Every structure is written in C-alpha cells, then in structure tokens.
Design a protein around this nucleic acid. Structure first.
Lengths: 683, 687
RNA sequence: GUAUUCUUUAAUUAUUUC
RNA sequence: GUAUUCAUUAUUUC
C-alpha cells in the first residue's frame, strides 16, 4: 500500500528474529501511526508468518493490537499449523480489555489447545466464548466434541452439546459422526455408540468410510462379525483395513473370521496382512488357500506380499512351495519376488534355502544383474556361508560385473563374524585401488574383525585415522571393540570423546566401562560409573549388577558383593543368575574365605537355582589355594557324581597346587601333559 | 622342538598368502607332526591357520584323519559350521580314510545348520556303512534333521527303535527334539503318546521338554491344552522359565492364564507380564497386574516402572498417570527411573499436557532437578513441540546453575526444525559455539530441516558447501538424506541431484523416500528421461513402489501431456490386487486431461470413480472446472459448481480465482457471474 | 479451523489444485 | 559335538 509502509515491512522481514523487538521499539512512533493489520498482512503474504507474530506481540505490549490484528495472525498460524504459537497468544494475550474475536479464530485456538492436550483450557475458552454472545459454528462444535472425546468420560456433556447445537439449528456432519464414535471408542461406550449411528440413520444422513472405520474401531478394542460386514456392503476399505490389523492382536480367533469372510482382493490381502505382521502366517496361508479356493487368481503382487510375510518368519520350505505354484500357474516371478525370497530374516538352515532360490533364479533365465549378485552375497552373508558368498563374488566379477561398495561391505560382514582381519585388510586394500573408498560401515566391520582377531594394531591404527570423522557408531564400536581386547587406553580414550561430542551413551558403554575397571586396577571410577548410569536416569542391568559384584570381588570386599546379590533377590524384577552366584563365590574363594563360599552355594540351590561346572570349579580353586586338597577332591566328585563334567583347568589348578605342596605321588595318584607337568616339577 | 619356532611363523603371516609360504618351508612341514602343528595353532586361537595348513598338507598328502578330526573339534567349538561343510565338500583326506564318530557328528550338525538335511542323512548312512557306531548326540542330531524336513515321523519312530536297540537310551535332548519335530508338522497326537510313553518309562521330563510339548498345542491350535501342560508342569515341580511364557504369549484370555498358575513370586509375575508386553499384548499384562495385587504380592518401584515402560511405548498417558498416583498412594514412591520412564513416552497428541502433568509431580515430589532431568524435560517438551515450554525449561536450567550441553542445544533445535524458525536456530548454534561446543551431525540435520520448513535456501547451500568440502560435517547417509528432502521441500533440483549423486557414490543404498522424491521433482518438470530412469532404478534396487510412486508417475505423464498413459496406470492399479488407486491418484489423472483438454474424457474418469464408490474431494472438482473454465466453455463449469455446495463440499480460493481470471480474459458475461455472490473483486476492478 | 488406524528417533503442511 | 520361544562369538573361571 503505502510506499513508506512497504519500506517498513521490507525492513522488518529482513531483520533477524532475536533482535527484532529492540528494533520495533526504535520505530515505535513510526509503527503506531500505521496500520499494523496491514503490516501483519503484508508480512504474512511475503511468507513471514513469524515476523507478524513478533509484531503482534510487540503491539499488544503497546496497546495497538486489536481483534483484527490477532485474528489475522491466528488464521495464518493454523493454516501453517503452529498450534504452539496459537496457544501462546492465548496465554499471553496481546489484547486490550474488551476484545472479542471472530468465531473462526476462537475455533482455531480451541483446536490448538486440543492439539496440546489442554482440554481443560479449551472448555474454559468455549464457555467464555458463548457468554460473550459468539455463535459457534459446525467446526467449533466438532472441535469441542473432540475435546470431550479425548478428555474422556464426558459422554453426557456430548449429549448436551449435540442438543445445544441442534436446538440452535446446526445440523451435524460427518466430522461430527466420526468424532463422536471415536469418543465412545475411547471409553468403551459400545452400546451408546451404535444407538447413536442408528439414530443418525433416522434423521437421514449418508453413511461413510471414515464413519465405519470409527465404528469398526469401537468393536475393535471393544462384534466385528455382523458389524464389519455391513460396513462393506453398505457401500472403501482404506484405513478401515488397518483397523483389522490390530483387531486381531487384541483378540484371538481364526474360525470366526474364516466363517465370516466365507459368507461374504485388497480386502483379502488386508486380512492376510493382519495375520502375518503379528506373527500368524499360518493363519494367512489358510486365508490364502480359501481365497484361491474361490475363483480368485492371485497375481505376482499378491504372492510377493505373502512371500514377504512368510519371509519375516523364515518359513523357507513354503516360500519355495509358493515359488512353485507361481511359475506353474503362469505367474512369473518378477525382480521383486527374488528380492523378497532373499530378504529373509536369518534362521538356521538358510543356506540351502538361498541355494534353492538361486537354482530356480538361474533355471528360469533371469540374467543376474550386478545388484542381484550383491543381494545374493548378502544372503549367504546372513547365514554365514563365507564359502558361498565368495563363490558369488567370484562368479560376479568373472562375468564382468563391477563390484561396488555394497559388494565389498557384504564380504566384509562375513569375515567380521569370524574375526578374519587378514582377509578383511585385503578386501579394503583392494577396494581402494579400484577407486572405492571405505565408508563408515566398512570401518565398523573392520573394527570388529580386529577385535575378534585380538589385533590391537589395526584397532589403534584406525583409532588414529579417526581421532575419518568419529560418528556415534564408530565411537561406540570402538569402546566395545577395545573391551573384547580388554584395552583400557582405547576404551577410556574414546569414552570421553563420546561425551565431548554430545552423545548420550547407552547401557552398553556404561556396562563395558564398569568392568574394564572392576577386573583392572581402578575400582572407583567404577563407582563413578554406577553413579553416572543412575544420575543419567538409566536402569541398571543384571549384567551391570553382575559386573558390579565382580568389582567388589576383585577388591577383596566380598560380603558387599553378597549384599548386591541378596538385594537382587528382592528386586522383584532382577533375579540373580548363576553368574551372580559364581562371581560372589569366586570372590570369597579369592580371599581364602571358603566356608562362606560354600554357604552361598547352599543358598543357591536352596533358592532353586542350579550350580554348574564353573560354579564347582571356583571352589576347587579356592580349596587348592590353602592346600586342603581333600575337600577339593570331594568337590570334583560332586560334579561328576551329578554329571557336571569338570574342566582340565579344574585338574590343572590342583596338579599345579599339588606340585607346590611337596606332594608328588599325590598329584600322580589323584590323576596327559599334566603328568608331564609333575615330571618337570618333581625333579 | 624346532616346531615352536615354526608355528609362530605361520601364526604370524598374511592369511591370503599363506599358501606360497607353506610351499616355502615345505619339507620342514612334511617331517613335522602335522596334527601337532594343528594342536599348537589352536592353542593360540589361530584356527584359521590350522585350516589352511590342513588344506595344504592335504594337498600334499600329509594329512591323516587324526588331523582333520583335530581341526573339526575346534571349528565346532569355535562355531565355524560353514568351514566344516567345506572340508566335507573338498576333502583333504587320502582315499580309504575313515573318521571318528565325534567328528562325523560334528559335521552332521554342521550340515544340519545349513539346511543341508538330505546330505546329512547320506553321511549318516555312510557313517554306519563303515561300521561306526553312532552315539547319543549322533542319533539326536539326525533326529533334529528328520524333524526339520517334514513328513519324517516314520523315520523317527524307526530310528528310535534302532538307537534303543543298540542299547542307546534317549534323553532330554532326544525328547525335546522328537516332540519339537511333531510340533513342526502338526503331529499333536503322536507327540503326546510319545510323551506319555516316554514318561511311563520313568523318564523324568524337564523344562525344555515341557516347553516343546507346549509349542505343539500353541503354535497352531489351542490355548486350553497348552495351559493344561503348564498345569502338569508345576504339578511336577518344574519351574517354567522365560521361554515358557513366550510360547503361551505367542500361543478374558489373560484371566485364564492366571487361573492355572494359581492351582508364584514377584519375579514370576514380571516374567509373564513382560512376555505379553514384548509380544505386543499389553492389555493382558495389565490384567495380570490387577491380580498380582488383589491376590497378595505388592509390587515395588521396579515392578511399576516396568509396567510404565510398556505403557510408554503405547503412550497411554491417562493410565500412566493413574498408575503414578496409585504408586504414591499405595506407598510406592517414584525414582529417577520412574520419572525418566514417564518422559520417555512416544510422541503423540496431547503429550504436552502429559509432560506438564508429570513435571507437576516431579516438582511437588520435592525432588531436586538435575542437569540430566532438565535435558529430558526439554527433550520431551521439544518432542511434542511445545517450543514455548522447552525454552522456559531451558532458562530454568541455566538459572538454577546448570550448564547446557550439546544435547541441550539439540533438543531446542529439534523444535525449531518443525517450525522452520531457522533464524533462532542460527542464533543458537553460534551460542553453542561461544560456549566451547561443536555441533554434531544431528545438529546439522535439525538445522537443515529447520531451513527447509522455512524456505531458506541460502542456508542449505551453506551447509552443502561445508559438507562437500571441509570436514566439519561428513556426508553421512543421514546428512545426505536430510538433503534430498530439504531440497525437495524447497524445490532445489540442482541440490538434490548432487545428493543423489553422493548417495549413489559414497557407498549408499538409497531408500524409497529418496527415490520417490527424485521421481516427483523430475516429474514436476518435464524431466521424463531421468524420471523413468529413477523408476526402473527403483525396480533394479529391489523395493516396492508405493502409491506415491505411482501417483508421481501419472503426474509426469500428465506433465508430459501424455495423460492417456496416465490412465493405463490408474487402470493397472485398479487390478494391482495389492494397491488401490487413491483419491489423489484419480485427480492426477483427471487434471492431466484437463491440462491438455478432452474434458469429456475427464468426465469419463470421474464417472467410474464414482462407480468404484470413491467419493471425490474439492480439488477433484476445482480441477474439473479448470478445463471447463478455460475452454471456450462456461455453461458447464457453472453446472459443475452446483455439485459442490449442493453436495456440501465447499469450494475455495484457488477455485473462484480461476473463474474470474479465465472468464475475465476469455467480459460482461463474467460480471453477472461474480455478482451471484473481497480479495478477488479487486482483480475484476483491476481488469 | 475440525474427524476414523499407523505414524512422533518423522518424506505424512509426502505426491493431485486450469 | 546335539534340543524348546523370540555388547549375548556380553558379566563370573583360585
């Protein structure tokens, strides 16, 4: 409008937001003389809804904001969807005393509070709304009914409002019906929901899709029998389908739905999906058969769906069967099919499956692409068939395809399992000359080959090249990788770096840390950790609790470890673990305290737990220590007398202790290379 | 002697070259106790090396069965099943060789773990063709093989006889395997008879045994018989472990499960509650929880937090709050875990008031807030989008004497990311900088998203340049992901191709979000060539095209003025059997005609749309008018209007704007049309 | 301005608007 | 070496 005002507006929309108020002040008099409403509008067209906001708040604090000013921002805020801002204009009103608003605007604020769970404020506002003589509209009504619906237990107030609205001649719509039914749905008002809809009929009213889904939902968590039926034939399965997907989980039946559906594709596929995503594939395959059994001829896309849900259950045998019915019915498998048959969540016996998929994947033409081979490598990688992954890697290249980074990472996954790093290094080095530079994943997979290789070299060689941006994964992978190698420098090093970069560490790191102190020479940072893990608000684990006991055990303070064990007995959620029992027994044994140690073994059994090899092994050590070899020999009996099968270390610890005690023929009688240990000892 | 020195050589050598290295010190090897070298190489965990030598020696003819058996024990002990199936397949033994049973059974199990059953049976046949006597574990492994093939019950009954005829007595491993086999075929009756018959032999069953007998009933059948087993279980005195309740959980139904185990402890109750939780059936666990009380045992805070957590993931606010009150009313006073659990809730509607209602309890609970608690509260208020309250929580943090961390600044930017309020987002990151803090990646993602919802393209590019060069921010899948999106929302084609470039270059494997966006952006221009290449490349990737992929394709053809091809897909989606055309699908098709004309065709589509049920929207009609509004025709676009309000759908701003502009440019016959009923009637004035 | 399940470490003010 | 459901090639081995 005004050239002076256009300059002012441009000057406002260009100014940063944090400084703007100190700026608007400087132009106080300049602003007051103008039409803010016109500035707000101009600041809204230009796409700067947040600058008008600032202006409004400024003017309210000055007295130059009117209803129309506010009403303009609000309409902008709701179309833009900034409920928070709406709610704040209401909590810090830029309005002068009198001040009444347009209906549309009040209903936008009501929706904003609703959107925030401030149902109690919405109702306060609604009351204030009609005591100022504002005629609410259909949308205002529907918004308020929604407030009542999510606030809960407000059915009577809903009856009241429906009355009030009709008595003022505002007939309900579809947003009114669904809103209401979902309200009954959230309160278990099954009975009164139906009487409602069936009253909607009376007064006239065309039924709907969203309606039925709401009604559906009622009987859902609440009947889906004679009900869900109507919804169909009444008239289209859109969202209504999903409702079936959770209908099954909150209940339990396979006969009614078969008996129902019988009586009657997507619709079919929907219900099948409902079964296979909650883990009822046996239930879906039956739905599939029934479906086939009645005319219906599935296409490739229906098979890919069934195979897809069978796949998450690793039902290899029937996936191949389905693969059969396809190709022998015309339904030629597509790319999506093989990818589906190869994206199986790994189980035991996956290799031969994969092998059979590949056999039909190559006995049916289908020229394997580059990505196809990568998919086939990943598959044998999941199983762990290094042998078959690499045969695929070799067949690949020998056919002229060029391996990508996805192909190298695949192979790298494998070796990682087996901690074969000498082969990993070769992969990496190969990929570099080919031009391919390792990514983050490629590194984590290296860190894991090394750790299972006990190669600290390659570990610290990477810790250097990274300290390779250190991502939360890499730093977390490094903390672990060092713990397998039990490396305190490395672990600690990158521990604080995880904090200095604004990452929140999980119980894994904390647990891993606590123990690299317990079994080491630090026993206070440990206490720091168990105080940090808590101060952090995290819930300690048994493992955490067990690692804890090991600390006290190594600090020669065992009863305290016994306390934590006992305290676990009440935990009501924790519940010891022979490890916890073992760990405590190991400590007492380590301090010469062995009666106390078998006293906890007695509890152990009494509690109905189950002593094991390692458990007995501990005592034999602690007995051998203070040379009292008879009570020790009595133990190994117990193990075997109960068939617990001792360990050569159980024997060694006695042999080596029988040697040092000047008793040689004893070491001999009692009793491989061990006897040899006595010979090189005796003389 | 001289061996200890030679082992270290092989133990310290590049694996992919060890062959030629064993070829080197060959004659020192042939005179060395191979099996001896093997035993030594394993004593240091160098088992990959003991294999390579085996294969070497084998190729030289220097490996005997005693050696192979030695490598196999380790592999099995080191869990290396594929490697053993390899030895089976290549054979490093000379002709006429026979192996220990312990080894043979280690291979059988290895063949079983790869699904190579038909092969395991053939090896078993050989093993007993060499007059080797199988042991218990051998018989048991083979049983496990029979049980995973299917239709193998007679072979199980027959082998049971043999093994029992060789004086070999079944065990718990046997029982669980035979019962579990019957569970994998639906052999309910025989599993029972077998159990009955096995019991009657004096065999005391066990947990594992009872667990398989229960999977029978529960897998595909009944919850009443499986529950009965649960019955007979305790009656025997065998305590159901965690795996027990998992079977039931996966097998008014919660009222039953509690009636049986009634004729337990607090840990028991939690074990079954958590079972139903981890399955996804939580209303049941609640039901038990109602009983654990009205039955005696009183739950503590650990038990309650457990329950709250379950509710958390379902974000069942009101009940969570009820439960927090019953806690503090029945005596159970919350802890730092209780609160944190309460604020770790899943985003949703009305979450802001919940958090306020929780914080209201943290405060009254006279519990000093810590630096951590603030970070949580800021995060939750930031997660629901209560920008206003996050910042209030923020200033309250930095005023009680706590120091923000990066998470603290990240929470805050998360909110702004939803609002697009990048100006503040900047002002923050700098503050993060002026405090000795360096922005994370997510910090860069948030800021990125923050610029997107706004429209600030200069801050995006300012991120790309700092990402495509310096190391301040590494091109992480995430960061490149947040870029394809933030450039779409701002329609920066150039800046997406670069990202789709690097993604398909930095070793990444694009996702449907990325593909589709690329498809819609190319389609939003005439970019047919690339777009179709993207679509197929979706196919060549191995992903399933959703509706948005199909709608974007139709709009491309629209855009390319081939709207007939657009309907072929709508038809194709009509019989997709898996994908049902969407409202936006139909419109996209109609507009494509109306954009190039043939509105009588546009009517053709609308017709069936209604024929397929399908209830049209405003846009549906606003588009139909477009063609009828600007096609030397007005008597129709007026008749078409009477289908909106007369059908209570209500037109809109883009609509009428097409009526005046199109009519006031096709005059007077336009004036009377607009008179039939603000911001517009200045266009007419402008004309 | 409003409704029916999933979505809340979010493509869901995602793709259609002569 | 072998079995039951769906950081673990995790924490205890005088």
């Amino acid at each position: 409008l005004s050239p002076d005002a256009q300059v002012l507006v441009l000057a406002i929309s260009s100014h940063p937001l944090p400084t703007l108020a100190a700026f608007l002040a400087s132009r106080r008099d300049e602003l007051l003389r103008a039409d803010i409403t016109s500035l707000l509008k101009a600041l809204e067209l230009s796409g700067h809804w947040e600058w008008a906001l600032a202006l409004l708040r400024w003017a309210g604090k000055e007295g130059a904001a009117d209803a129309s000013a506010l009403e303009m921002v609000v309409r902008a805020l709701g179309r833009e969807g900034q409920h928070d801002a709406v709610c704040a204009l209401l909590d810090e009103t830029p309005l002068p005393p009198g001040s009444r608003l347009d209906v549309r605007a009040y209903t936008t604020v009501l929706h904003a509070l609703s959107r925030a769970g401030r149902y109690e404020r919405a109702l306060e506002l609604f009351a204030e709304l009609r005591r100022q003589g504002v005629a609410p509209t259909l949308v205002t009504y529907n918004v308020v009914l929604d407030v009542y619906g999510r606030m809960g237990r407000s059915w009577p107030r809903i009856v009241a409002l429906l009355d009030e609205m009709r008595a003022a001649g505002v007939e309900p719509d579809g947003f009114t019906a669904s809103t209401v039914i979902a309200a009954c749905s959230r309160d278990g008002l099954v009975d009164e929901a139906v009487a409602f809809f069936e009253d909607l009929k009376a007064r006239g009213h065309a039924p709907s899709v969203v309606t039925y889904n709401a009604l559906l939902q009622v009987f859902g968590k609440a009947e889906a029998l004679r009900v869900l039926g109507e919804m169909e034939q009444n008239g289209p399965d859109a969202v209504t389908y999903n409702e079936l997907a959770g209908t099954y989980a909150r209940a339990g039946f396979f006969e009614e739905a078969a008996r129902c559906l019988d009586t009657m594709a997507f619709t079919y596929n929907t219900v099948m999906t409902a079964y296979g995503n909650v883990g009822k594939v046996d239930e879906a395959l039956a739905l599939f058969d029934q479906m086939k059994k009645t005319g219906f001829v599935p296409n490739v896309n229906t098979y890919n769906l069934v195979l897809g849900m069978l796949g998450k259950k690793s039902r290899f045998t029937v996936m191949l069967e389905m693969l059969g019915e396809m190709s022998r019915s015309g339904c030629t498998p597509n790319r999506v099919t093989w990818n589906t048959m190869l994206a199986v969540s790994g189980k035991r016996g996956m290799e031969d499956y994969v092998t059979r998929v590949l056999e039909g994947m190559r006995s049916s033409g289908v020229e394997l692409s580059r990505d196809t081979y990568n998919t086939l490598i990943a598959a044998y990688g999941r199983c762990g068939s290094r042998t078959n992954a690499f045969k695929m890697y070799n067949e690949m290249t020998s056919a002229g395809f060029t391996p990508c980074i996805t192909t190298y990472n695949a192979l790298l996954n494998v070796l990682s399992r087996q901690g074969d790093w000498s082969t990993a290094q070769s992969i990496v080095s190969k990929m570099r000359t080919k031009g391919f530079k390792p990514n983050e994943q490629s590194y984590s997979l290296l860190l894991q080959c090394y750790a299972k290789g006990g190669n600290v070299a390659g570990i610290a060689a990477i810790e250097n090249e990274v300290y390779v941006f250190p991502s939360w994964v890499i730093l977390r992978t490094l903390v672990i990788a060092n713990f397998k190698c039990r490396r305190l420098d490395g672990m600690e090093t990158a521990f604080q770096e995880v904090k200095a970069r604004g990452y929140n560490p999980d119980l894994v790191i904390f647990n891993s840390m606590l123990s690299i102190y317990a079994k080491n020479g630090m026993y206070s940072k440990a206490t720091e950790v168990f105080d940090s893990i808590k101060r952090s608000g995290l819930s300690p684990d048994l493992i955490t609790y067990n690692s804890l006991m090991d600390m006290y055990a190594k600090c020669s303070e065992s009863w305290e470890a016994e306390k934590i064990l006992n305290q676990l007995k009440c935990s009501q959620t924790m519940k010891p673990d022979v490890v916890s029992y073992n760990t405590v027994i190991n400590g007492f044994c380590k301090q010469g305290l062995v009666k106390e140690a078998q006293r906890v073994l007695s509890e152990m059994v009494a509690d109905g737990m189950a002593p094991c090899a390692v458990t007995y092994h501990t005592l034999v050590g602690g007995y051998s220590s203070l040379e009292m070899f008879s009570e020790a020999r009595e133990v190994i009996g117990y193990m075997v007398q109960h068939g617990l099968k001792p360990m050569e270390l159980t024997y060694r610890r006695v042999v080596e202790s029988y040697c040092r005690a000047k008793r040689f023929e004893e070491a001999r009688g009692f009793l491989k290379a061990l006897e040899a240990y006595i010979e090189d000892a005796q003389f």
